[model samples]
Target: KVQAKGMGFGGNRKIGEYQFGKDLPLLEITRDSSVEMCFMENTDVKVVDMGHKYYSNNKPMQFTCKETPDTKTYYTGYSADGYDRDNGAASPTNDALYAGYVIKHMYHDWYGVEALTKSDGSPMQLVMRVHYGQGYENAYWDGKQMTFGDGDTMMYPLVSLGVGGHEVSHGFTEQHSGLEYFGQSGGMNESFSDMAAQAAEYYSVGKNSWQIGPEIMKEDSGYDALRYMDKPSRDGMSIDVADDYYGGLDVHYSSGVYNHLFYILANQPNWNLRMAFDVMVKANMDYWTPYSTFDEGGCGMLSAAKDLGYNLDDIKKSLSEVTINYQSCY
Candidate 1:
């Protein structure tokens, strides 16, 4: 944690570089649990709960399956331990099996994250739930936890790793910038989710493509994805870059620029997926505010590149080529 000075954003320094006024708590290690879940594959799955928030929004309707079963009833404790079977036997929480797997997979990308304890020192354990609501068709992070839905006929199940990454990254955003849900900042918020999802996929598999939620969107609709970072305009509604920028445009569409920018950056020889993730995390955590503009974002990106010791010249060229337009405020 870098402890430094105060900021004079609008005062004597009208023309100057961005100031990172210290207090940037570098989140290096966030997990410290020694407990292990002895599952079939010996995979250390952390936390999985059946959804009760849909009904009450407070308590978790947990499940337990001990090594030796009760044999007669399954819903007694709603309990399941290390060993498990999920094709719908005595336990009815089928989605928990998939949701938990995806949550754990995504959690490994971050290793761990800081908890929201009042002390600001608690290490968080990743706990996720499925079966959020009956045919809800969406997944969400309610600032503290994650929940996924069992899709209706027209939508794919919301528990895929990519989808989970998107939701979990919202927690990441909230903890960092708390970006507003309007205009360019809101677009950045959406792009970050897509960015995190694709990164998690790249970390999971060696393949790092431009597709976001391919299986989820393709299975639900005939289209390939909810949005395309490589060819944002291919979706017909998404904006490729600044020319597509407009106040009335929905954030989901406007987010394509940064999403595409990160895709290009991560795919470049200088920046791999991990490097891209680091730059993004640093930029978001240190530079942005809820009302930050596109120009401010470009500035943030450049600042992050310099701070993280990446090639500033290459980043500058890319920003210019892509017309990110950091010369003036938007």
Candidate 2:
């Protein structure tokens, strides 16, 4: 309940200064349908092929048959017919039930750490929620509920498994770095979500080819790699940082550089000491989530490389040249 040093509630600063970004509730109004989602430990709830209830009501008679989803499903739990950005679930998919199962287990595997743990240190509750608010763009780690919405239908879909894991991971960030939600601090906050989300993805599919957004958005959903942390530009956007130092309206967009950089650091497997750089960025991202910018990660990848013990002069020169090719990090 106490605010972490330098960061405020939910990974934001206590100061009044902030940025313009996603407003979740309003966006829900644009979406009409809603669902009450919950997180269940993989061991707690059985994932059976034929004997499971995937329907919203969970009536004994209404069971989800198999993994193959028939069509897109949304907004069936609750509906309001308003064509706003966050109205209600506009439609529902036949696979909706299975979608719920995937999301539940995915959260269990990815961010199950956020849920209370057992004596053996496992997720405690089937941490879950019902009728998550509408128009709730920008998945958040609110204390009680993991509120969500049907994306603008134009951009994203209602919170699915990976999306749910991404939002819930913020709870870990809150308890950990609680990265300042404004400037470089905010970038750290967003990057951790991406980090945890990606981790969850890998947890779900161990060898699943390493990608995010396959469940939430279509491959052709107008974005490549379903929101590439590798290159924010590839996703057609970034955290909206302005190198001119004009500042941004929202820390959400401005966070791209840090997220992208973290991806780069996390991508490679260490060959030298059998040490994985996995811990490198995760260390910085984790340690710095609270005090990251104090040293690392605030500047760019080169700065991160410096933290990794590279020659500063050579790293900077090479990175400077690298920047000539990729000017997206502002």
Candidate 3:
């Protein structure tokens, strides 16, 4: 098992032992801890006990720790019906459970390492809901929780690490940059999500072939991706490169430009995927503005590069290729 560090209830124990932990500090990975549902155990962002409410209307179902006791006994029942999808734990089992693990792990990477906490001194708690709604085929962060929808057959399940990364980064963007999800900055915000998701994928797996949403994208006629970084135009809708503010296009289409830029910059001579993530994280925490432009994000990365000691010349060249001036991004 992958070893990790965090705060837990009572004292600590030897490795491999469940800390029985969350919101308090550490995430206690548990099973069937809630209404046949699996969630992270934390006092701060406690996964409020919910009954088997993971049904059709996609309503909120609540449970308690009193009846929550099944460990390793939780089974999968993805019947595509309403409340039946409430199989527990965010493991490799179901969408909700799997997303739980991914997002929890993501929070550790961001906030645990001093990523960011609210000024009130409390860190954000993430609650992931899967099998959310019927024919929903979508995933979104409802300001307070993360919800995933089961697709219509081909796109059946969109609850993978890459998709979770993108959605989870949206939470960070709201907390950090507060970038609008509409115009120029909106594209930047979208790009940020893609970047974070890419980083998460790189860390969990390895390498970013410049594809986004590779798991849930099934065109049935052509490509199997929501977007591509190496060649943005491959998505047909996504802009190949950023020239000016193209607010007319969809946010996902516009985000292609910077996604491409990040892919290019991430391939810097001395930087690997892990270090690339640090650079992006630093840029988000330190440089980005609430309404940042492409140049602003590029400059932010350049500044972060200095902090990370990357090759300035190469970074500059990469930024310039995307028409983002490092001078301005800096």
Candidate 4:
């Protein structure tokens, strides 16, 4: 029952509750919501109607997730232009229902239903929210939910369906390989997500451009995805990955390396980079649940590859091959 926080000019509500009930709480300023909030409701959405302003006229953005809904369920208009990507709402059309299916599907594929079991072996539920704000243009996780914004149409669309996959992967990272989010360690943190994001893209969606923010509605955005793991420079932006920071920003900048590392491991030619990266991801899903770092990642990948029956040398070789050209990916 996570809420979007502030969508209705300050009247945010729970993810799945789109209707104005007989007695709804009053809102403040309708602070803009985050991507995690949106996913909590529905992952395929970009905006919602909070008794008002659910969408913009003549400025529609659309997509199809290639998944299906149940027989009794039909596509609902609530998801028009990603609007149906809410927690409480379902699409009048099949176009939007696939979000929940994809989310659960990826979770099962990665960790299995057993993943729902935490340290105490308690089952956890999957929740997401979509259609967060008016031209808000950002996606983020709110501990429990994923919230997304409608694209300003000036920079990007409402984000890709795979983006939802990327967000949830963070939860997985936090749950298992809780990499410290600072220093070389922090870089590992960002990289873990980037690496997992790629895996999520690969396994959930398959072979993306490897840029972070391709989900926006705009045709040409100054920001391409959020970060690039393979070729951060390919986005023609600055991946000025700083290892040390004067402020707390160090961890975020350091994340550049991790993203690049994943890209390097995925795209390198000499070491079967793709194979190495894939093996690392698979291993993490199988085990590897501790705070990890770049050095740790290097070792972890080799260990994972070995467990999966790949040559230890091949795995290590991939690590060396990619790091040689290491640069901030995005």
Candidate 5:
């Protein structure tokens, strides 16, 4: 015999004692006053309700409950326009959700590594300031957090997936390669962030046009994206080949050479997206230094690809396509 308590509507009250069969399993009381009863046959079972009014021997009971895992979120967003910060207590807005999703994706795609970390290897929680300033048109990672501006007529909101991925990847680059943000190394830093942006888009949507921030561009602006990876020269300012790269060129423009090289390598018949992405990541994490030049970065890529069991000839051909002279890492 079992004495059960009645709940709901009329409040708690003692219900009538009920007899159970000898073969019936034991019932364990859970934290929420619900009971977890195991059946003898090991069949899937769930406790519908503990209320005595709903209890019957013949009728089927319904159970509807959802359990959310206790997972820690590495990304959080605060609005610069006076909106509250999203701390998982309430429903997050779209901008906050997008930022969190992209950062989380980067964390997972990098093989369980945190997107950003401190010098002691502890995980750093990334804070994104969305809607920063009225009619603001840019997003950047300032070595601490990411900031996004609401776009004007030229672009949409700066909180798109590509922008988030690109900006957060700057943190990744800072932590890993510590590449100086000037000269050829600076260009490499920018190009690596762009690569991460493309990878994030592909990982989330399953396809990418290899354009950065197309989602944020206004259709009437006559530009499809901020930059084109397939052909950087389409931007009218970015040079696509290494021969055009000069020491005085802006880092963003100088990044075009490696961006074009990445496009070629990723699209090659002998190399797939994951293979190419892994090589780039390996090169950035293991080989490239703060002052590595374009040719040195190319050699780092070749060495990384070789270590990952890829064909060196294919990598060399891809490098040559961008007019970047490939040097032997040995």
Candidate 6:
């Protein structure tokens, strides 16, 4: 396993930047053999009479506790063997652990948002189905959980942080705006997920490539990534400006408009990625609606920037550069 000192939570730790699982730091969670669940905190087992409890209409609950009373639960360091689904019979994989880490860090650390919850107000856990199907070539968030495929000859495993963060961000969007998965709102939905993935990469490994899924692409595919935010037209399927949008364009391709706009906004003079990401997140959570059009979404972003005290003229210019006419904030 590749190892090098890298900045991570709790200080510098031995982190690996493998192509299959990029920027995965050492994690402390362990698999519960009995239940097949990975637990970061220690699980305490107590014998209880299930027969008597069931007759009395009582149920059993498992409590996860810390081994040390005062110790906080967090990833201490990386272990090549930790949280392996195969129990070390083969090379250890950290796909699930790393995905969970990035998701938690995105909401709790970067966005400073409350823990993500479901519509029923229950806590939303990051459930990943990895190696989903034999040579399955894609990944997606299916409202409840994220699924990754092992990929065919054209691609590597679809469990990289970029793919993971992108899919999980779909869950976040579902909970917030519930942006419809078609038309302009659908394009915004896809673009928001891409922005979140980029932000997660920037937060973790100091990467700001504005490209998604590059690590998952095979060298012979003749393409570096699934999409490029900076210049989406490089993919040939995606359009880089609002003027290129047409009715019935695939949401994935139509997303190029806002993705390019975000790149321009983030890279503007005296602006940074975090600032851009903050505005995007705020606009998505507070302003953009389920059916917001491109102009409406642009207005939401500008409104978010204004509320956050960012320069409005630069944001308007960024929008105009992408042929997105900024609308007056409501």
Lowest lDDT block of 10, candidate 6: 43-52
Ranking 1 against 3 by lDDT, winner: 3
Point out the higher-scoring one by TM-score: 5 or 6: 6
- What ordering of candidates by lDDT runs from best to worst? 6, 5, 3, 1, 4, 2
What would the TM-scores of all predictions be? 0.70, 0.50, 0.73, 0.61, 0.71, 0.77
C-alpha lDDT of residue 289 in model 2? 51
Residues 26-69 of candidate 2: C-alpha lDDT, one tens digit per residue: 11111112222211112322111112122233211111111224
Alpha carbon lDDT of each predicted model:
0.57, 0.38, 0.58, 0.45, 0.63, 0.67
lDDT of 1 by residue, 175-228 (tens): 788887789998998888888777766766656557665654424356766678
Cα lDDT of candidate 6 equals 0.67
> Any idea how many clashes model 6 has?
2
Model 1 per-residue lDDT at 185: 93
| Candidate 1 residue runs with Cα over 4 Å from true position | 1-53, 57-61, 64-119, 125-127, 218-220, 328-330
lDDT of 6 by residue, 198-280 (tens): 88788887876789877677767787888999899999899999899999999999999989988999999989999999899
Residue 123's lDDT within candidate 4 is 51
TM-score of 1: 0.70
The Cα RMSD in angstroms, rounded to one decimal, for candidate 6 relative to the true structure is 9.1
Between candidates 1 and 3, name the one with more favorable TM-score: 3
Which residue pairs does candidate 1 place in steric collision? 63-78, 63-79, 63-80, 64-78, 64-79, 64-80, 65-79, 65-80, 65-81
Most TM-score-accurate candidate:
6
lDDT of 5 by residue, 1-330 (tens): 122221111000111111111111122111221542211110111122112222223211222222325411111112112122221112112333334455565657655677788788777756555545656678787896676665677776566557877888898889987888999899989999898888887776678769987766777778878999999999999889899988899988988988998899998986767778888888988899999988899999988988899988889999898888865557
Give the alpha carbon lDDT tens digit for every residue of 1-330 in model 3. 111222222111110112223222233334343244433333223232223235333222222222324322222222211123211212212334334555557657644642234568676655556555555667776565666665554454456667777777787877776777877688878888888777766665566657876656554625577789877888778876678447577778889877877778777777666666677777877888888878777778888889888777877787777777555432
Candidate 4 ranges beyond 4 A from true positions: 1-70, 78-97, 110-119, 157-159, 204-206, 220-224, 234-252, 268-274, 282-291, 322-330
